[PDB]
């Protein structure tokens, strides 16, 4: 009789659908993970299914007894099982055995035993649903009896059509663990075979909810959107105006004398509160037959017509008082309509309608030569004629058409006077309750119903306005119907919750950001069980942080500053640190760096770096074609005919998709085919020290791709939908890449503006230095080193893509987006769309075509909306990829076919060159750039006053190393002695501010 | 098209679907043979005209 | 609202102002070079000389009319403060 | 909610699109304003010609 | 149906406006990388005039 935790037990097969290596998210009555489990012949209640794990090898457990009271009314189920085969008798008995051959089978009785069935760590799911008792058995005979915190699926053992009521269950004895099941959501991982080897809960932990959302068992480091939190309502209040009992009740309901029973009173109950339910206590109402509405209280609804009636009748005659009834009252006094929705209230009135000498005063009509209709009054006082001779007076068969009730005190219930109120429509039952404030509560003010928080209002109403709206047109303020007070309707707090995780592999601790909510408010809601995301992150008193984005109860804030890793919001970011925990910090926008500006202070670098950076661009998208008829209609002629009435929707979608496909073809055409002729690289392969092995084609393999191209390609990976192959095969795209690169590395950039003009590669690089304000003399002066630098840089690139698996994020995102779109499109084929089923074939061979037309139309509308949404999404993504492909074509026409002067366009620095590399549905640009380095502080002066005249550098900058004044290039330290060929003169030495005296030597 | 299947149905599963919820395997109890349901071939036709 | 939520931007307005200040300070102290590597200091009348050289105007003119140009700039920026302040349609987009 | 449950992953698609738009806005401001490596301060006190 | 069509219209409008603002933000990034972080020679790209 201890309490333990069910680690991961209680996973059974929900359906007989085989699935292979999938992740299926299903909601069903499961055993929640880590729930409280009773380890144990007491009476155990059967709460909508039980997980029973009996662990014994002595066979003490001899089955089960099932029932509610065992009083020979319910079918008491007796189950026995020795080792494999189960004997099941759904009997009905008072008692079981408990009020060699170590067996006792006495029980108490075998009456109405409708059905009998035959078939160590024995676990059983017992469920009762859809008239089926379902037993799921996992008979894994482990060697021992200790409870193992392990995993094992439960196969469906038996389903029995009982259709009975069960509330309790006890175990036959001649240990075990018991747990209860709840309706939860579970992500089941079927393995290759149909073996659900793993199950992930969804109501436990923030971590095991992002897994449910992403349909995966390993989540990557980041912030994940998930379910939305809301503070649930705490109470419910319904308020009504001051209950005006003043309806024509007491004078009508409590009058000593009425008129004739056939001549009912016009008891018009209008423009008042029909609260006649209190009068139930004034008189002992016996025949209370309310056929349409039965109010024990009635104070809300306003109605036009009541047609209330007053009657005086006997006791054993109410059988004729029913909707659509026939009899003396219906055919002579008053006919009750078939749809008679009202209260017939007859009460005995011996104490106020009886007298000692006889109360011969209340006449009722017994004879009439006409039939009453609903909502009619009979006024005809003529004596009924039942004979051929004319009827005048008594004597022959001519009775007075009114019989007087002989009301006596000694008569029985069937003859005692009943005074009757008939409510016969062609208010609303609820008693007003106290008003709460400052609590998220449901409100029903005077029929206006909603949920929210009611506070004090400073809004002044004119003394006729009840509601209160805004430009949003929502009820903002309501005035109390009862106390006549005004109060606003501030809604209950709500928002999104997000889960910040460092990845499944790294750790399992997580953080939760309740977006846009006060930490005090969320903590209070947590305290008084008010949050909908039932899982509570364990509050420690320091693991709660407040920020403009919301309340982050998953981590501690640190006054330190670091670069953003997982963006939280409002600058705050979160990251894992190792002790090991998640921390939240204000994002550090890099290091603070003050440049030591001065009147005369310049810095010219004395060295540089030939950097190579990767620039990945999507260029294309998967060409998809959808057959509208086959997708919408599973080759059904009736569905095709119905679809034909919707105009040219299929034609429109086909036109849009074909346009998208030809746009993809033109995108890759414009990007990769800007070269007239395929250029061939020379066989010598020597390029002045530059390597070009990882970018030139490698003939010693198929597809003739470069090694970097090979890494790029190896790094990136039914129902009318068809993926049309691209016009340009990847071999052809590689051939264009090779031609472009060969023209770049042999003829330079000249091949893009005309015929290719050969030029030695060092000369081309010298001119590319000339293009960024660096004299060509640098390159020759540092050729080898520069080459080695390039040879090093490209090498790192080969590792940079290899080491980092997230480098090709954009292309993989494009591919995954297209795959997700197609997967959603095919998955909504299983959407019922508010119809009978999601398969046309079943609907056809289940319903006649006139009725099946409605369901087919609903499915057609749903699938057509799905198709239109997919087509519009594809059009938007096609426009986005068209912009990206135009950018890629611009880069290839400027970065590759030339050197671009636009800053940060063809690389992060002074652009030198670029090399294209084909990639799945995209291009990768290797941008080779010049990044200066090894700075040197210097003193500068805008001019030089030598011969009484100002001198300015032709293209250099005047610097000084403290003693001598030189002029140097403004991007690479190369001091030079100032001469006339090196400076130009303009005016005398007065206008220039920072002019400095010096000597300008003539050569 | 109903062809011999290598998918090991445990002896309680009647149908067999895929991630797209399309029945890619069935077995009739009379034959008790697991067979896949790869659909009838289709696609599109396109006319090349000069 | 009724399920709508306005998520605040990740970069707070203070951080965006700090980026603006950093870009402007690098532009006015180190010139154009801070975007192509380490920021290299240079006096502003020299960076303006470079920028005149970049539009086919020899730098001498700048120095030859330094102060005047400053006042022109000092005037122009002033009008901006009025131009946005007076016209309410300036920030139309 | 139960009636909406039969309409497939419409809500999931809308939520994914909106989150994509949000991260796109964040990336937009990141690309526009964060092209600088290090925060640069103005000189303590100085004019600029 | 009505409310979900309203949501879809709103989301599509937001997607189109997001594409427009993405183009505008790309232009702004190009300007700051070519008009601020350097002097651009493109005509009438960084203002009316040289
Ligand atoms: C350019 O670099 C590549 C890669 O280093 C050189 O190719 C071979 O690289 C392997 C190591 O990966 C060495 O063991 C070989 O000796 C290298 N050369 C040969 C002939 O296979 C390539 O040789 C370099 N370029 C030139 C022109 O030598
Ligand atoms: C599936 O069952 C077959 C039965 O022969 C077995 O060989 C195979 O390994 C099983 N696969 C898995 C992943 O359980
Ligand atoms: C109607 O009620 C009045 C008293 O208000 C009573 O005198 C009269 O006889 C009643 N008639 C009927 C049909 O109840
Ligand atoms: C009328 O009120 C008296 C008390 O004053 C009560 O005894 C009697 O039963 C009531 N009759 C009805 C029909 O309300
Ligand atoms: C939360 O409520 C308290 C109430 O005193 C208030 O002081 C605090 O500023 C609020 N916080 C936020 C984030 O609005
Ligand atoms: C630059 O020169 C001006 C000229 O008046 C002077 O005011 C300023 O202090 C100088 N800056 C220095 C010395 O850093
Ligand atoms: C520049 O740095 C490289 C290493 O990156 C070094 O080999 C070279 O000698 C340096 N040049 C100068 C001028 O210091
Ligand atoms: C600036 O250069 C001078 C020499 O010209 C040097 O003394 C000083 O330390 C430098 N300041 C720096 C690098 O911040
Ligand atoms: C400045 O450069 C000249 C040129 O060689 C050299 O002779 C002198 O020693 C250098 N002085 C300083 C302080 O750098
Ligand atoms: C430069 O020399 C001239 C005389 O040759 C002198 O008048 C002038 O003041 C000097 N300028 C400086 C800045 O020393």
From Swiss-Prot, chain D:
Domain of life: Viruses
Known role: Precursor of the fusion protein processed in the biosynthesis of the S protein and the formation of virus particle. Mediates fusion of the virion and cellular membranes by functioning as a class I viral fusion protein. Contains two viral fusion peptides that are unmasked after cleavage. The S2/S2' cleavage occurs during virus entry at the cell membrane by host TMPRSS2 or during endocytosis by host CSTL.
Protein name (database record): Spike protein S2
Organism, scientific name: Severe acute respiratory syndrome coronavirus 2 (2019-nCoV)
Lineage: Viruses, Riboviria, Orthornavirae, Pisuviricota, Pisoniviricetes
Included stretch of the parent chain: 750 to 798 of 1273
UniProtKB/Swiss-Prot annotation, chain E:
Domain of life (superkingdom): Viruses
Record annotation: effect of changing residue 30 to I: In strain: Gamma/P.1
Intrachain disulfide bonds: 35-46
Cited function: Subunit of the fusion protein that is processed upon entry into the host cell. Mediates fusion of the virion and cellular membranes by functioning as a class I viral fusion protein. Contains a viral fusion peptide that is unmasked after S2 cleavage. This cleavage can occur at the cell membrane by host TMPRSS2 or during endocytosis by host CSTL. In either case, this triggers an extensive and irreversible conformational change that leads to fusion of the viral envelope with the cellular cytoplasmic membrane, releasing viral genomic RNA into the host cell cytoplasm.
Name of the protein in question: Spike protein S2'
Native source species: Severe acute respiratory syndrome coronavirus 2
UniProt gene name: S
